[PDB]
Amino acid sequence: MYAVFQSGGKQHRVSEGQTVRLEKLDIATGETVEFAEVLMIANGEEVKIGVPFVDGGVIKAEVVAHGRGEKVKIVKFRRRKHYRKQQGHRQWFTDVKITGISA
Amino acid sequence: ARVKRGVIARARHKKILKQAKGYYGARSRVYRVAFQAVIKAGQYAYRDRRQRKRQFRQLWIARINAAARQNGISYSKFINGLKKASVEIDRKILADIAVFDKVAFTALVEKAKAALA
Amino acid sequence: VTGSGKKPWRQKGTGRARSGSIKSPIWRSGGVTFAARPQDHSQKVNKKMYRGALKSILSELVRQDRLIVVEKFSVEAPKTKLLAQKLKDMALEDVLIITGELDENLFLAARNLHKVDVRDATGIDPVSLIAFDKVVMTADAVKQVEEMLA
Amino acid sequence: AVQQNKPTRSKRGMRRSHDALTAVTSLSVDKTSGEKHLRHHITADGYYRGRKVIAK
Amino acid sequence: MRLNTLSPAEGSKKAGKRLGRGIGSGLGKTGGRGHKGQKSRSGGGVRR
Amino acid sequence: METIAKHRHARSSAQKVRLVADLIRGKKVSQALDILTYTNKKAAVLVKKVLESAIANAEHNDGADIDDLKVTKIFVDEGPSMKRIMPRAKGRADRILKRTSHITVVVSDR
Amino acid sequence: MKTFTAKPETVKRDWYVVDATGKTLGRLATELARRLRGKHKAEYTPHVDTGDYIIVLNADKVAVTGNKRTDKVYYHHTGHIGGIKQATFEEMIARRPERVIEIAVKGMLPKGPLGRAMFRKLKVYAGNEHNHAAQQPQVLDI
RNA sequence: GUAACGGGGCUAAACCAUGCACCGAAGCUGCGGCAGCGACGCUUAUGCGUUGUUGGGUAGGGGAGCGUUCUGUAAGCCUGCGAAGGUGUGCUGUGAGGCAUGCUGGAGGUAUCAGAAGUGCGAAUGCUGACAUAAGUAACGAUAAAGCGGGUGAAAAGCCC
RNA sequence: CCCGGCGAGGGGAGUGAAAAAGAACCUGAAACCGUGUACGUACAAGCAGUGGGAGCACGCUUAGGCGUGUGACUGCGUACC
Ligand SMILES: [Mg+2]
Ligand SMILES: [Mg+2]
Ligand SMILES: [Mg+2]
Ligand SMILES: [Mg+2]
Ligand SMILES: [Mg+2]
Ligand SMILES: [Mg+2]
Ligand SMILES: [Mg+2]
Ligand SMILES: [Mg+2]
Ligand SMILES: [Mg+2]
Ligand SMILES: [Mg+2]
Ligand SMILES: [Mg+2]
Ligand SMILES: [Mg+2]
Ligand SMILES: [Mg+2]
Ligand SMILES: [Mg+2]
Ligand SMILES: [Mg+2]
Ligand SMILES: [Mg+2]
Ligand SMILES: [Mg+2]
């Protein structure tokens, strides 16, 4: 059984027991969170879809780890015009394990 | 006091050179060239951070079109149908569905058709 | 730079860079274009300001209980060992002794020891006071200091 | 008649691929004694086709 | 108590203008002069 | 066992030498020596000598059989340039390098 | 999650016989190009060759609208001084009708190695019968 | 050189009238994160419950930092159970960077908070050194010419006879 | 002691803590020139990068997958002063 959900604007496909990186959701590192933003629950033979968000669908997802990802070197630059910026960034992420898709 | 501008300079060079790894010819050795190359890469990275999203969208849309046409519908019309339905499934997800579980895609197509009619 | 006003090569003709001198700073054995001279760096210490600073530091010392006040502090012979013994008795190491009337023997004793220093009541400086973490002062010395400062 | 850019080490290496010599395929053997020699050139001693012809 | 415990007031010790220290300085390349002027060159400007 | 033989400062460019080295790269020792012998190069003699030395070392110092040995590593490396002044036409001077050569020939029965 | 990308290991290319008898050229050609690309293929990537293999037949029996039979000139250069070469559509049909179709296909596909690969998958015929019977190719109305 | 759609091609895939749509920007919005500037409730060395708003930028103006040598702090502390340096690597910062460890190195380095500066190089036909590049290319200096025998020697077109 | 010209140079043996301290002698960076291993690369055009990424190799983990290297093909993109 796999499910489709939108969280933080961006939508993600997920299966049962899959670890997917999401955005920095300000919740404890060892806590179970529920998702009602589910668009599709796919059983295998009988898929379930309704309106923008499904009526009776809840995703039980365990928070695994908070942290900052890969560092990016934001180089802004202009040729011949004496200018050079360099900013760095690591995007804050929350890794989620999905314990089960509940209907 | 006089400061010998050596060790720090070396360090400065070092990071640039390490950034310039996998660069043909002078780019992975000669500093003048190397720094330039690194800068250009950075520029491109910046651009592509903002450009790559569009490429992926183009890909996903194309995939959807391929799938839609196989099922027997034009892409724009399909999208309109989806909008009418109010289901907020994005391009990426649709593409993924098309790639793997086709029954779901078929169902989606049917729904879109219903919305249209 | 000990050298020449001779141009190493001509202005136009030759293909090389536009040469002026071997003396030029952009060279091997050239000038330090901004060479330093024997310079006085001494800042104008305002007298009143100085006084204030002294007062402040003394107050701080008092607050910290590191300013120890004595009546009788004098070494009999010019003897370092005796001084050391005295220090041990009164529990001190890093110490500035300030005296009103300078005992010579004591001063002599104070010469070699790194942590111990004896100064006259009129001959004291802020950094020295700051430096030594347990400052010891005679009553007469203290009085003299007070007179100086007001 | 002068280069306008510096050519790579790569280019130079490529050029040098032909400039490398051809090794001699194999030595030639005298049948009587067993002397190893160059092709159609005589032995070190002066033997040729199993026969000493030159003393030097 | 120590020399490493005492610190000056903020604003009392200002940074200073180092002219010609790259791009990040901002006060670099030409420092604070501009381009090709008489006022730009060293030993430049005019009398009061 | 891998036994090293070096020659340092051969009055010829390492580049020139490399050609001969390549010819006998990876070959069986006696065969390699033979190849070197009938080679028409001057650098061919130096490398041959080095090989001989290596063989000798293997025989004496280690105690290895000549038959099993192979010419593994043969890195001909660049030597210090002896800078001499050659005058040219119209008062122009060229400091011509007289490049020397390092020749490392290593031999092993494996 | 992560976007799938096509693998030449996983990509299965089927075989299609295309009849060009009494049918309009350009539209057919474009369709062929699309097929070659994989713009119909569900697992399409613009970086991996995904599309199906094509045999096209009756290159001379293709239809053109209006004056195009004599009006349309197909230009190629020799690489020489005055080596600009003129060939009308009819003329092309006369000697080698297979060329025109191929050229069209080339025009309608990417200029790179992938484009070349796609082109390779097109095998052209002036006649009605194909020799590639062992592949079991299915005829599609293009 | 087709060369006056960008090209293939197109009788619509042109051109004009109308509508439903989708794409199409680093635009707006979504989620997250960082700041700069005001309004406010409480306070302070202001943090914020916040709240809004703002955040391309050359010359140029203002503000904030990091690091290098030295100075004190420091006869302090780490350090031959391995310093500086070199070289990797892993981590960590918004950035100059910083911390940790592997190997080499074989003796010094410097916390913290200050102070002082020949302080931070990619460009000056910069200067000095090293090393490429053309390249194993042109060249080897008069077009008065060698050629053989024997000799010594590791080896002889050049040296002796 | 052996090699080689009673050469150079080397290798042993020896000295020392160390010769990865041999007079070209402390450390020994970079360019530059190399060998060996890794993967790619001989129908494919362009600031040689970037983004995407097939595969192939190699480390781990108890599976799972991640790293690292390579990058065929591919979108965009014309150095730096
Ligand atoms: Mg004069
Ligand atoms: Mg000087
Ligand atoms: Mg500015
Ligand atoms: Mg002007
Ligand atoms: Mg100027
Ligand atoms: Mg001006
Ligand atoms: Mg966008
Ligand atoms: Mg700004
Ligand atoms: Mg030092
Ligand atoms: Mg420099
Ligand atoms: Mg500059
Ligand atoms: Mg020659
Ligand atoms: Mg040439
Ligand atoms: Mg020639
Ligand atoms: Mg010649
Ligand atoms: Mg001559
Ligand atoms: Mg003779």
PDB file of N, CA and C in Angstrom, chain G residues 90-141:
ATOM      1  N   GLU G  90      10.579  16.425 -57.314  1.00  0.00           N
ATOM      2  CA  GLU G  90      10.335  15.463 -58.376  1.00  0.00           C
ATOM      3  C   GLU G  90      11.632  14.760 -58.777  1.00  0.00           C
ATOM      4  N   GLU G  91      12.676  15.569 -58.945  1.00  0.00           N
ATOM      5  CA  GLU G  91      14.001  15.082 -59.313  1.00  0.00           C
ATOM      6  C   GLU G  91      14.512  14.097 -58.263  1.00  0.00           C
ATOM      7  N   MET G  92      14.335  14.472 -56.999  1.00  0.00           N
ATOM      8  CA  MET G  92      14.756  13.656 -55.870  1.00  0.00           C
ATOM      9  C   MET G  92      14.042  12.301 -55.895  1.00  0.00           C
ATOM     10  N   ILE G  93      12.735  12.355 -56.156  1.00  0.00           N
ATOM     11  CA  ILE G  93      11.881  11.167 -56.250  1.00  0.00           C
ATOM     12  C   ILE G  93      12.405  10.238 -57.350  1.00  0.00           C
ATOM     13  N   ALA G  94      12.721  10.844 -58.493  1.00  0.00           N
ATOM     14  CA  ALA G  94      13.243  10.121 -59.651  1.00  0.00           C
ATOM     15  C   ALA G  94      14.446   9.210 -59.328  1.00  0.00           C
ATOM     16  N   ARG G  95      15.491   9.800 -58.758  1.00  0.00           N
ATOM     17  CA  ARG G  95      16.729   9.106 -58.434  1.00  0.00           C
ATOM     18  C   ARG G  95      16.584   8.358 -57.101  1.00  0.00           C
ATOM     19  N   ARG G  96      16.505   9.096 -55.989  1.00  0.00           N
ATOM     20  CA  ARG G  96      16.465   8.500 -54.648  1.00  0.00           C
ATOM     21  C   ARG G  96      15.413   9.168 -53.749  1.00  0.00           C
ATOM     22  N   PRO G  97      14.184   8.601 -53.717  1.00  0.00           N
ATOM     23  CA  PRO G  97      13.069   9.162 -52.936  1.00  0.00           C
ATOM     24  C   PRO G  97      13.233   8.991 -51.423  1.00  0.00           C
ATOM     25  N   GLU G  98      14.115   8.070 -51.039  1.00  0.00           N
ATOM     26  CA  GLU G  98      14.408   7.722 -49.661  1.00  0.00           C
ATOM     27  C   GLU G  98      15.112   8.864 -48.942  1.00  0.00           C
ATOM     28  N   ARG G  99      15.968   9.584 -49.667  1.00  0.00           N
ATOM     29  CA  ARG G  99      16.692  10.732 -49.117  1.00  0.00           C
ATOM     30  C   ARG G  99      15.808  11.800 -48.477  1.00  0.00           C
ATOM     31  N   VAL G 100      14.734  12.201 -49.160  1.00  0.00           N
ATOM     32  CA  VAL G 100      13.894  13.353 -48.771  1.00  0.00           C
ATOM     33  C   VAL G 100      13.300  13.126 -47.384  1.00  0.00           C
ATOM     34  N   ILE G 101      12.719  11.937 -47.232  1.00  0.00           N
ATOM     35  CA  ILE G 101      12.077  11.500 -45.995  1.00  0.00           C
ATOM     36  C   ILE G 101      13.080  11.549 -44.844  1.00  0.00           C
ATOM     37  N   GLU G 102      14.265  11.001 -45.122  1.00  0.00           N
ATOM     38  CA  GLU G 102      15.355  10.943 -44.147  1.00  0.00           C
ATOM     39  C   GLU G 102      15.735  12.348 -43.692  1.00  0.00           C
ATOM     40  N   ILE G 103      15.859  13.237 -44.674  1.00  0.00           N
ATOM     41  CA  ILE G 103      16.222  14.631 -44.437  1.00  0.00           C
ATOM     42  C   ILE G 103      15.182  15.294 -43.526  1.00  0.00           C
ATOM     43  N   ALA G 104      13.911  15.040 -43.840  1.00  0.00           N
ATOM     44  CA  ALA G 104      12.786  15.572 -43.075  1.00  0.00           C
ATOM     45  C   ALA G 104      12.869  15.114 -41.619  1.00  0.00           C
ATOM     46  N   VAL G 105      13.144  13.821 -41.458  1.00  0.00           N
ATOM     47  CA  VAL G 105      13.269  13.188 -40.148  1.00  0.00           C
ATOM     48  C   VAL G 105      14.384  13.871 -39.341  1.00  0.00           C
ATOM     49  N   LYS G 106      15.511  14.087 -40.018  1.00  0.00           N
ATOM     50  CA  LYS G 106      16.685  14.733 -39.435  1.00  0.00           C
ATOM     51  C   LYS G 106      16.325  16.134 -38.940  1.00  0.00           C
ATOM     52  N   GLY G 107      15.605  16.861 -39.792  1.00  0.00           N
ATOM     53  CA  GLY G 107      15.150  18.213 -39.492  1.00  0.00           C
ATOM     54  C   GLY G 107      14.286  18.230 -38.246  1.00  0.00           C
ATOM     55  N   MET G 108      13.371  17.267 -38.194  1.00  0.00           N
ATOM     56  CA  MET G 108      12.430  17.120 -37.092  1.00  0.00           C
ATOM     57  C   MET G 108      12.991  16.514 -35.796  1.00  0.00           C
ATOM     58  N   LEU G 109      14.254  16.092 -35.796  1.00  0.00           N
ATOM     59  CA  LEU G 109      14.888  15.586 -34.569  1.00  0.00           C
ATOM     60  C   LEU G 109      16.113  16.404 -34.117  1.00  0.00           C
ATOM     61  N   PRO G 110      16.498  16.297 -32.816  1.00  0.00           N
ATOM     62  CA  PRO G 110      17.741  16.861 -32.273  1.00  0.00           C
ATOM     63  C   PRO G 110      18.987  16.655 -33.138  1.00  0.00           C
ATOM     64  N   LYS G 111      19.883  17.637 -33.093  1.00  0.00           N
ATOM     65  CA  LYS G 111      21.125  17.640 -33.879  1.00  0.00           C
ATOM     66  C   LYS G 111      22.235  16.746 -33.302  1.00  0.00           C
ATOM     67  N   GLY G 112      22.107  16.389 -32.023  1.00  0.00           N
ATOM     68  CA  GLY G 112      23.133  15.637 -31.293  1.00  0.00           C
ATOM     69  C   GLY G 112      23.198  14.137 -31.560  1.00  0.00           C
ATOM     70  N   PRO G 113      24.051  13.408 -30.794  1.00  0.00           N
ATOM     71  CA  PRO G 113      24.230  11.957 -30.846  1.00  0.00           C
ATOM     72  C   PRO G 113      22.930  11.219 -30.639  1.00  0.00           C
ATOM     73  N   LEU G 114      22.101  11.697 -29.715  1.00  0.00           N
ATOM     74  CA  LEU G 114      20.805  11.090 -29.483  1.00  0.00           C
ATOM     75  C   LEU G 114      19.933  11.157 -30.737  1.00  0.00           C
ATOM     76  N   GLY G 115      19.959  12.311 -31.399  1.00  0.00           N
ATOM     77  CA  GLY G 115      19.236  12.508 -32.650  1.00  0.00           C
ATOM     78  C   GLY G 115      19.690  11.520 -33.709  1.00  0.00           C
ATOM     79  N   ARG G 116      21.005  11.361 -33.807  1.00  0.00           N
ATOM     80  CA  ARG G 116      21.613  10.423 -34.743  1.00  0.00           C
ATOM     81  C   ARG G 116      21.137   8.997 -34.478  1.00  0.00           C
ATOM     82  N   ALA G 117      21.120   8.635 -33.199  1.00  0.00           N
ATOM     83  CA  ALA G 117      20.662   7.328 -32.750  1.00  0.00           C
ATOM     84  C   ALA G 117      19.213   7.090 -33.173  1.00  0.00           C
ATOM     85  N   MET G 118      18.390   8.114 -32.958  1.00  0.00           N
ATOM     86  CA  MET G 118      16.977   8.089 -33.323  1.00  0.00           C
ATOM     87  C   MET G 118      16.817   7.836 -34.825  1.00  0.00           C
ATOM     88  N   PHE G 119      17.615   8.569 -35.597  1.00  0.00           N
ATOM     89  CA  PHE G 119      17.630   8.470 -37.052  1.00  0.00           C
ATOM     90  C   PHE G 119      17.964   7.038 -37.485  1.00  0.00           C
ATOM     91  N   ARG G 120      18.986   6.476 -36.837  1.00  0.00           N
ATOM     92  CA  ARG G 120      19.434   5.121 -37.091  1.00  0.00           C
ATOM     93  C   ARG G 120      18.271   4.143 -36.991  1.00  0.00           C
ATOM     94  N   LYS G 121      17.384   4.356 -36.023  1.00  0.00           N
ATOM     95  CA  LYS G 121      16.221   3.495 -35.829  1.00  0.00           C
ATOM     96  C   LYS G 121      15.203   3.521 -36.978  1.00  0.00           C
ATOM     97  N   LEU G 122      15.295   4.538 -37.835  1.00  0.00           N
ATOM     98  CA  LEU G 122      14.498   4.622 -39.057  1.00  0.00           C
ATOM     99  C   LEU G 122      15.231   3.930 -40.208  1.00  0.00           C
ATOM    100  N   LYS G 123      14.560   2.946 -40.806  1.00  0.00           N
ATOM    101  CA  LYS G 123      15.051   2.243 -41.989  1.00  0.00           C
ATOM    102  C   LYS G 123      14.089   2.448 -43.155  1.00  0.00           C
ATOM    103  N   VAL G 124      14.604   3.084 -44.204  1.00  0.00           N
ATOM    104  CA  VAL G 124      13.798   3.576 -45.332  1.00  0.00           C
ATOM    105  C   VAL G 124      13.752   2.642 -46.546  1.00  0.00           C
ATOM    106  N   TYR G 125      12.583   2.602 -47.187  1.00  0.00           N
ATOM    107  CA  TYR G 125      12.333   1.767 -48.363  1.00  0.00           C
ATOM    108  C   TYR G 125      11.554   2.518 -49.444  1.00  0.00           C
ATOM    109  N   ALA G 126      11.996   2.346 -50.688  1.00  0.00           N
ATOM    110  CA  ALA G 126      11.305   2.887 -51.858  1.00  0.00           C
ATOM    111  C   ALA G 126      10.175   1.962 -52.315  1.00  0.00           C
ATOM    112  N   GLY G 127      10.329   0.666 -52.033  1.00  0.00           N
ATOM    113  CA  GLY G 127       9.348  -0.356 -52.403  1.00  0.00           C
ATOM    114  C   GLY G 127       8.222  -0.536 -51.400  1.00  0.00           C
ATOM    115  N   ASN G 128       7.468  -1.620 -51.577  1.00  0.00           N
ATOM    116  CA  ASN G 128       6.290  -1.923 -50.760  1.00  0.00           C
ATOM    117  C   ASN G 128       6.558  -2.981 -49.682  1.00  0.00           C
ATOM    118  N   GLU G 129       7.537  -3.853 -49.931  1.00  0.00           N
ATOM    119  CA  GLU G 129       7.844  -4.977 -49.041  1.00  0.00           C
ATOM    120  C   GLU G 129       9.119  -4.753 -48.224  1.00  0.00           C
ATOM    121  N   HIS G 130       9.064  -5.153 -46.953  1.00  0.00           N
ATOM    122  CA  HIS G 130      10.215  -5.108 -46.046  1.00  0.00           C
ATOM    123  C   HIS G 130      10.823  -6.498 -45.831  1.00  0.00           C
ATOM    124  N   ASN G 131      12.135  -6.529 -45.605  1.00  0.00           N
ATOM    125  CA  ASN G 131      12.876  -7.774 -45.369  1.00  0.00           C
ATOM    126  C   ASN G 131      12.932  -8.165 -43.887  1.00  0.00           C
ATOM    127  N   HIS G 132      12.497  -7.250 -43.019  1.00  0.00           N
ATOM    128  CA  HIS G 132      12.576  -7.417 -41.564  1.00  0.00           C
ATOM    129  C   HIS G 132      11.309  -8.085 -41.004  1.00  0.00           C
ATOM    130  N   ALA G 133      11.046  -9.305 -41.475  1.00  0.00           N
ATOM    131  CA  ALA G 133       9.847 -10.068 -41.110  1.00  0.00           C
ATOM    132  C   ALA G 133       9.981 -10.831 -39.787  1.00  0.00           C
ATOM    133  N   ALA G 134      11.223 -11.124 -39.399  1.00  0.00           N
ATOM    134  CA  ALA G 134      11.535 -11.885 -38.183  1.00  0.00           C
ATOM    135  C   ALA G 134      11.245 -11.125 -36.881  1.00  0.00           C
ATOM    136  N   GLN G 135      11.277  -9.793 -36.956  1.00  0.00           N
ATOM    137  CA  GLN G 135      10.990  -8.906 -35.818  1.00  0.00           C
ATOM    138  C   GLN G 135       9.506  -8.876 -35.446  1.00  0.00           C
ATOM    139  N   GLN G 136       8.661  -9.291 -36.396  1.00  0.00           N
ATOM    140  CA  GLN G 136       7.189  -9.235 -36.310  1.00  0.00           C
ATOM    141  C   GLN G 136       6.670  -7.798 -36.076  1.00  0.00           C
ATOM    142  N   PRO G 137       6.891  -6.888 -37.058  1.00  0.00           N
ATOM    143  CA  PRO G 137       6.492  -5.496 -36.848  1.00  0.00           C
ATOM    144  C   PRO G 137       5.015  -5.242 -37.151  1.00  0.00           C
ATOM    145  N   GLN G 138       4.386  -4.396 -36.336  1.00  0.00           N
ATOM    146  CA  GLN G 138       2.960  -4.080 -36.486  1.00  0.00           C
ATOM    147  C   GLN G 138       2.721  -2.750 -37.203  1.00  0.00           C
ATOM    148  N   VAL G 139       1.837  -2.785 -38.200  1.00  0.00           N
ATOM    149  CA  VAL G 139       1.533  -1.623 -39.043  1.00  0.00           C
ATOM    150  C   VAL G 139       0.627  -0.645 -38.293  1.00  0.00           C
ATOM    151  N   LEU G 140       1.074   0.607 -38.206  1.00  0.00           N
ATOM    152  CA  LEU G 140       0.290   1.685 -37.601  1.00  0.00           C
ATOM    153  C   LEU G 140      -0.018   2.765 -38.636  1.00  0.00           C
ATOM    154  N   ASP G 141      -1.255   3.260 -38.606  1.00  0.00           N
ATOM    155  CA  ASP G 141      -1.726   4.287 -39.538  1.00  0.00           C
ATOM    156  C   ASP G 141      -1.118   5.655 -39.214  1.00  0.00           C
TER     157      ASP G 141
END
